[PDB]
Amino acid sequence: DGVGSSSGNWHCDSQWLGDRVITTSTRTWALPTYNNHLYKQISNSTSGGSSNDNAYFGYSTPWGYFDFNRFHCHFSPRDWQRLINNNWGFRPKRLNFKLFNIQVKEVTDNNGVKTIANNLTSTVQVFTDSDYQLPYVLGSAHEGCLPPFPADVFMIPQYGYLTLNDGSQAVGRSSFYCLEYFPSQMLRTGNNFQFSYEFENVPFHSSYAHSQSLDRLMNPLIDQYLYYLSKTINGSGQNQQTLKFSVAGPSNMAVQGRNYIPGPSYRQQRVSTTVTQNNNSEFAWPGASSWALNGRNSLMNPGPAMASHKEGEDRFFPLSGSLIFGKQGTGRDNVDADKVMITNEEEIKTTNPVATESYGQVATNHQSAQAQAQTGWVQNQGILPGMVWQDRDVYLQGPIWAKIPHTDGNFHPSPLMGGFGMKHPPPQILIKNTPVPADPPTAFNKDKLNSFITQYSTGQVSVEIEWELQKENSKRWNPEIQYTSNYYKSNNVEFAVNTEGVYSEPRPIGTRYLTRNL
Amino acid sequence: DGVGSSSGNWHCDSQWLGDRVITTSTRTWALPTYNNHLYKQISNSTSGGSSNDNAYFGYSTPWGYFDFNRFHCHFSPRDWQRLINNNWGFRPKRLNFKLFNIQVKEVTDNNGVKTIANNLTSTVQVFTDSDYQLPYVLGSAHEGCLPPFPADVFMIPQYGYLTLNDGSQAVGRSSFYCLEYFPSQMLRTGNNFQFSYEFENVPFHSSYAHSQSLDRLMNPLIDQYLYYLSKTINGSGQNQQTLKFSVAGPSNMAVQGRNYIPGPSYRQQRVSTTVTQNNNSEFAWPGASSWALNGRNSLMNPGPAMASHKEGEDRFFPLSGSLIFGKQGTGRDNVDADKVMITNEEEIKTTNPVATESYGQVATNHQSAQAQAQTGWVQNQGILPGMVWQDRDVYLQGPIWAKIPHTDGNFHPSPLMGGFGMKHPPPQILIKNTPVPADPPTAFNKDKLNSFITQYSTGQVSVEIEWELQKENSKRWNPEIQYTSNYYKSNNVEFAVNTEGVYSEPRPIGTRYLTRNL
Amino acid sequence: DGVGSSSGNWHCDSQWLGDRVITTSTRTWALPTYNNHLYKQISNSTSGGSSNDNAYFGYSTPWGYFDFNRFHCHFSPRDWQRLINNNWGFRPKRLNFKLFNIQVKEVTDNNGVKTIANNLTSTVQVFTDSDYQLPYVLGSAHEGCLPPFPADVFMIPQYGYLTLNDGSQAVGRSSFYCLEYFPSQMLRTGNNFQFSYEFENVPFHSSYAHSQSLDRLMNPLIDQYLYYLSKTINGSGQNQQTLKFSVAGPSNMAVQGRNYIPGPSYRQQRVSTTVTQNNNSEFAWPGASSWALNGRNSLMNPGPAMASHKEGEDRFFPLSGSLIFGKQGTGRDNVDADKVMITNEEEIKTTNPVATESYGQVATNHQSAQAQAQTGWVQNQGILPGMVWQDRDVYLQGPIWAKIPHTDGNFHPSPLMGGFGMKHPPPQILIKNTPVPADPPTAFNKDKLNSFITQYSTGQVSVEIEWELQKENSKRWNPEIQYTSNYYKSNNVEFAVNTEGVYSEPRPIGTRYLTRNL
Ligand SMILES: OC[C@H]1O[C@@H](O)[C@H](O)[C@@H](O)[C@H]1O
Numbered sequence A, B, C: 001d002g003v004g005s006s007s008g009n010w011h012c013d014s015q016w017l018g019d020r021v022i023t024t025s026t027r028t029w030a031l032p033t034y035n036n037h038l039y040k041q042i043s044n045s046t047s048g049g050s051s052n053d054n055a056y057f058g059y060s061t062p063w064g065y066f067d068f069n070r071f072h073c074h075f076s077p078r079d080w081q082r083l084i085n086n087n088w089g090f091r092p093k094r095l096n097f098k099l100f101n102i103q104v105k106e107v108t109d110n111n112g113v114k115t116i117a118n119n120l121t122s123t124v125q126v127f128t129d130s131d132y133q134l135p136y137v138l139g140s141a142h143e144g145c146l147p148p149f150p151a152d153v154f155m156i157p158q159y160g161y162l163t164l165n166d167g168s169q170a171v172g173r174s175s176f177y178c179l180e181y182f183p184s185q186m187l188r189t190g191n192n193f194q195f196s197y198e199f200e201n202v203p204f205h206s207s208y209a210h211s212q213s214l215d216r217l218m219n220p221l222i223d224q225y226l227y228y229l230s231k232t233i234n235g236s237g238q239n240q241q242t243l244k245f246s247v248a249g250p251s252n253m254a255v256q257g258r259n260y261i262p263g264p265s266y267r268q269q270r271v272s273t274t275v276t277q278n279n280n281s282e283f284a285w286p287g288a289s290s291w292a293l294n295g296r297n298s299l300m301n302p303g304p305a306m307a308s309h310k311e312g313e314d315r316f317f318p319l320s321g322s323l324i325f326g327k328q329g330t331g332r333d334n335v336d337a338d339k340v341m342i343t344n345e346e347e348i349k350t351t352n353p354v355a356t357e358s359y360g361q362v363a364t365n366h367q368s369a370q371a372q373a374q375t376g377w378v379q380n381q382g383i384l385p386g387m388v389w390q391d392r393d394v395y396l397q398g399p400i401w402a403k404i405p406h407t408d409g410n411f412h413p414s415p416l417m418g419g420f421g422m423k424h425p426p427p428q429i430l431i432k433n434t435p436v437p438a439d440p441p442t443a444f445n446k447d448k449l450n451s452f453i454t455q456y457s458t459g460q461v462s463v464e465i466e467w468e469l470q471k472e473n474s475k476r477w478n479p480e481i482q483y484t485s486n487y488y489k490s491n492n493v494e495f496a497v498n499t500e501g502v503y504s505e506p507r508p509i510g511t512r513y514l515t516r517n518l
C-alpha cells in the first residue's frame, strides 16, 4: 500500500480447541546483504581444512531463508506443558506465513561514523520453493531459527548448499543453482507477503510412554500351553544326555513364547558422566559407531532410536546416540559437560533395545557329542518380522520435521533426529534485499557492477501452525507423571528472563509423560 | 427373564458355504471366586524366586476371562481337515459371543460336609474391554481356553496383568487398574449376555506349501544371458591370474542371477531327538538364542519363521525355534520327549532359511596380490530388499490371533507364534460373580467387609466365528498330499475319547498340504 | 491512511446533559524506549535495599502504559465544582479511548550533538488487556497519569509487575509474562487506534454529607417507651443495692435504644500539625497501625474509612489514615508539612467512628458482690449486624477506580483509597515502539541483536468518559455549603498557570458539600 500504513499486526496468541491447537508467533527480523551480492563456489579447499570425511563442494548465495523448524518457535514452555501433559499425540496440519512491515535501510559511512537512513524505494524479494527444486537445507538441524522468546530480534541465516564432490573438486554431475532464476515477489515498504501450506498426512507423534514392557505381556497367574527345553543332561557324569521339557509359566518368564520382539539395534559406545569411569585414551572418534558412504565415514549420530541406558544407569549415555543441546551462553568448542544438556531416550526401554548393549545372542555352530554349543553377540540387528519399536522423542528445543529424501525406497522414514518426515515438508522461504548500485561510470563499461549501496532490511514474520491433538482415553486408576515446575526458591524463574535480560531454557523437555498399555 | 426359563440353547453346528465357514461352539463353564474378592500386588518377591530375567511386578484380580483363542475351540478335527485339505487360505471375519443359563450357587460348610444350594438373587457381572483399555492377556499363549472337546466342563481362568518394574519394585510409571472402574452388565439367573465383533482386515493365512523352491525358478532348458566370473587363475603356478567369464545355465544353477532372495534369519542351536548325538553338558539356557530388553534376557522362543531342519534331518529341531505342544496328561516339569509334541516348519524350506544354519557368507576383506579372499558366516540377517518369506504355520492346537502392540512402528506384524495380528483383536470378556457379604455387625464399623458368602457360578458360552475361505485354483496334474487318518488297527480311535473318558489329540495338525507355484 | 493526513482531532469539550456528563480530554504524549528493548528480572536485591517488609521480586518490561485513573484527568476544576455542588452522586458509565497522529522519530548522535529526524516506516504497537490476563498495575495509585492541565506534554510510564517471592528469590509458583505474547495492533504514521469500554454496574459515589448524626435520629420532643437501668445503688452505705429503671427521653439521649450503630474501626495513632504537641521520639513506623501478610508488615495506610478528627480537633490527623497529596514542585523525600496537602474525612463523623479513638467499651468480667464491673477499650471492631458507614471521599487529585482482587470472597469491595471497585475495571492499554535493528553483521550470527536505532514516539490520546449523575431532591430550607473561590486579591489565580508557566492545584477538593438526611 503506502509508506505511512502498517501492512500487518503482531499476532502471538495460541488457542486451544478440543482436538486442535493453533499457535501463532510473531518475530522481528533483520536481513543483511550476504556475499557482497555474489554467488561463490565454496569447498573444504576454500575453508583450508583437509580430511576426506570432511571434504565438500558447494555454493554460498546472497540469499537468506527463514527457519521456524524448532518447536520452541511455536510453543511457549507453558503451552508445551499443556500439550505433553494432556495428550497422547499431536501432528501438524496447516501452516500460514506472513512477511509485513518491511523496512529497507541505507547505511552511510564516511570518516568512520555511520548514518542509517530509510531507503523508501528499495525492495526486498521473497519466494517459496514450492516444487522442491532447490537443495533442501531445513532438514539438517541448523541455527538461525526464530528465537524461542518473542521479544528477541533475530538475524536471518544465509542460504547455501552442497552438491557432489570428489575431494574439493566437483564432478560433471554436480549442479549449480541461481536463485535469481526463480520468480520472486518484490516488496517495498508497504508491501506484504503471505502463503499457506498443508502438511501432508503424517502419523501422530507418540507423546506417551508405555506402562508395560514388551517382555511382560502375559498373565502372571497362568501357565502357557507351550513347552521349552529345560534340561539337556540327566546329571553330572559321562553319557548323561536327556531331553526334558517344562511348561513356560509365571516362575520362568524369560523362556516363554512371545509374538513380538524388540526393534532394531546398531550398537553405541557407552560413556559415563562420571569421568573417572571412562577409559584413559581418546576414543571419541575412534570408538564411535559410523557408516561409510563412497569412501567417507559419517559418524552415526542419531542412529536408530534406542533406550539410552538401562535402569539405574542414568550416568551412562551413548557416545553419539543422543541429542545434545547447549545451555544458554555455551561456547562453540570443547565445552564441559556442565554447559551442555544431554537428553535421554529412557522411556522407550520398554520396546527398544538399549543403545549400549548387544541385541542378543545367536547360535554360531552345531553342537554335537564333540562340540559344545557356541553363541555370539549380536552387535547390530536389522529389521525382523515381528519387531516393534518406538521412534525418538520430540523436544521443545528440537526439530519439528524433515524432508524425506526422494528415492526409490526407504523404510519407516521417520527422521532419526526426531519429528515428522515428509516427502513435501514446509517449503523454504528465501529472502534477499535487492542490490542497489552506486553511481556507475559516465562512460559505458561492460563489466558487471561491483559497487553497491550498503543496505539491510528489517520487518516482522508471522507463522501460524494448526496442530491436531490425540486425547488420552486411559482407565489408569493411579495418578500419572506430569511435567512440573519445582516450587523451591530459585534465584531465577525457570524459562524466564535473566536479571540482565537473557532468556534461557534450563533443561530439555521431552514429550512423553502420559502412559499407555503396550 | 425368569427363574424357570432357559435363556439360551446349545448350538455347536458348523456350516460350510462356498467361500465361508461358520463355526459355532457351546461349552459349560464354572466360575470360582478369585483372590477372596481382592486385588493383590504380586511380584517375583511375592513368588519368592529371584532372577533378574524373571523379575516382574503386577496385580492379580478377582475377575476372570474367557479365552477361545485356540483353533481347536472352533474346529473339530474333521472340520479342520475339511479346511486344510480343500483351501489355499482362510481368515476370520465376524464373531458372536453369548453367555446364558447362568446359575449362581451358595456353598455351605459346617462340620466339614458341604451343601450346595441355588442363590437365585445373586448376580454375575460381565463386560468386554472394547476400547482396549486393559492390559491384553490373550496374546500370550495361555491355558484356560474353551476345551476342544464339547462335552468337557472348564474352569474360567483368573485375570491378572503385569506393569513396569525394577526388580520386584514398581516405578512411578507403573499403572494400576481396578476392573470395577468399568461399566459391566449384571446378570441373575434368567439374564443373558451377548456381543458381536468384526475382525479387522487381515491377510489370509497361507494353507499351502510351495511346489517350487526360491532357488529353482528358472527354465532348466535355457541359458541366461548373464555372465559370472568362473576362473580367477589360468592354472597352477606363479603370476597366473585371469578373469574368465561363463554363461550361467542349466549345468551350474547355483551361480545364476536371481531377482529374489530368502527371508531373514536369526540362528538357533540345533538339537537332535537322538540323544547320544547331543553334547554332554547343559546348553539349554546357555546355548540359547535370546534378545535383551532393559537388561533382561528373553529367550527367543518363536523367532523368525524358519525351516526347522534340512532334508532328511527330521531328527533335528531348533532349540527353542519351534512350538512344542504337550500330549494329554503330560506333566508340567521335566518331561521326556515322548510326552511332548515338537512341531516342524519343514514346508517353508522353499522360501525360508533353515533355523539352525547360517544365512550365507559375506566378504570380510579386500583380496589382493598379498591377501587371499576371506569370507565369514552370516549368523543373523535382517530384512533386505528382495527378500521373500512365509510366515509360521497354524495348528489346530495353536493360537488364532494376537494383539499388535500399539507403537510408532512395526514390521510385518504377523504373530511370531502364529495366526493373525490385529491392532484391535477380539476384545477381552471379563467375568466375575459379585461379592455377597455375610451378616455384618449390628454396630457400625468403617472397615471394609472381609466376610462373604462362598459362591460360584456356572453357565454356557456360545462362540460363533465366520471364516472366509480362499479356494484352490490349481492346474496340478498329479494328486496332492492330504491329511488322512491311517486305517490300521488302533486300540483307540484318534481324536476320540479314551476308554476312561479322556479326550486326547494324538498329534499336531498343521495347515499346509495343498501346493502352489512359487 | 497516509503521511500527510491527520488521523484525529483535538477534542477537549465536556457536555452537561440532564442525568449524564461526558468529559473528553486530549493530551500529547511521548514514548521512550524502555530497558533497551529487554525484559529484566528485578528484585530488592537488584535495588540493593534489604528489609523483609520491602523485599520483592518481579520484572520490568520494554512496554509502557496509559493511566487516566485520576479525576483531574477528566475534569477541569470548574467542571469538578459543577459536579460536586449540584449532585448527590455520580458514577462512570462508558469509556472511549483513541491514539492518533503518531510520530516515530530517529535520534542520531555523533560527536555529542544529536539530530532528530522522522522515521516514517517505523511502527508503534498497542494492545489492551481485555481478559485481565496481566498483573493489573492501575489500581495502586501511581504517577504517570495524563496531566491535569491540557497543555502539558507527558511521558508515558514504564510497565512492570511483581510476582511471588521469598526474600529476593522467586518460587516455582512465580509467573513470568512476555507482553510480545499478546496480539497487538501495529501503527505507522497515519494509523490510529481506538477501543470502547463499558463500566460494569457500580454504586454511585456519595457526593453528600449527612445533615444528621447516627446518634441523633430521634424525636427530641418525645420519650421512648423503653427503659434503661438508671440506678444500681439506693445510696451511699453498705448493702445498698437496687435496680432502678428510667424512661429514655430527651433529657438523656445517650442511653436511648437505637436500631443502628456506627461502622467498623481499626485505630490509628493521632498526630498533631502543631509540632510541639507530638512526642519527642520517632514513632512514625513504630507507632503505626499495620497488617501482616506471610511474615511481612504492611502499614495500614488508607484503612477503613473513619472520621479524621473530632470536632474542633482539625489540627489532628491519623498517622497514615488519610490520603496525603503533594503540592506542585514538592520533592520526593523528607518534605515539610507545608509542602504537602493532608486531606480530612471530617464529613463522615456522622456515621463513622473517629480514626484516632476507640470504638467503644465492652464488659470484661462478671460483676458480683465481690467484683466491681470492669470495662475495656475496643481498639479495632469488625463488622456487626446493624452497622452503617460511609466510604472514603473522592478527590479531584485522587484515583477513580480500582480492580477488585479475584478471590473467593470479599466484603464491600469499595477501594480503600477511594472510588469505584470493579471486577473488570477499564483495561490496561500497553504501548511500545517496535525495535528497529541497526545494521547487522554481514556473516551470520545466532546471538540476538543487541544493537538498535535510537527512537521515540509522540502522539495524542483522547479519553472520553460518560458519567451518570444523581440529582439532589432536597427540601432543605436554608442554603447549603458549596465549594467556592475566594474573592480576595491573590498574586495568582487559583487553579491557573504560574507566571513561569507552571500549573498548580492549590488544595484538595473533596466531593461532599450537599447534604442529606440520615
Ligand atoms: O580420521 C577421521 C576423523 O574424522 C573426524 O570427524 C574426527 O573428529 C577425527 O577425530 C577423525 O576420526
Ligand SMILES: OC[C@H]1O[C@@H](O)[C@H](O)[C@@H](O)[C@H]1O
Binding pocket: A252, A254, A255, B051, B053, B285, B286
Ligand atoms: O541366567 C539366566 C537364567 O535364565 C533362565 O530363563 C534359565 O532357565 C536359566 O537356566 C538361566 O539361563
Ligand SMILES: OC[C@H]1O[C@@H](O)[C@H](O)[C@@H](O)[C@H]1O
Binding pocket: C051, C053, C285, C286
Ligand atoms: O522494621 C520495618 C521497617 O519498615 C519500614 O517500612 C519503615 O519505614 C521502617 O522505619 C521500619 O518500620
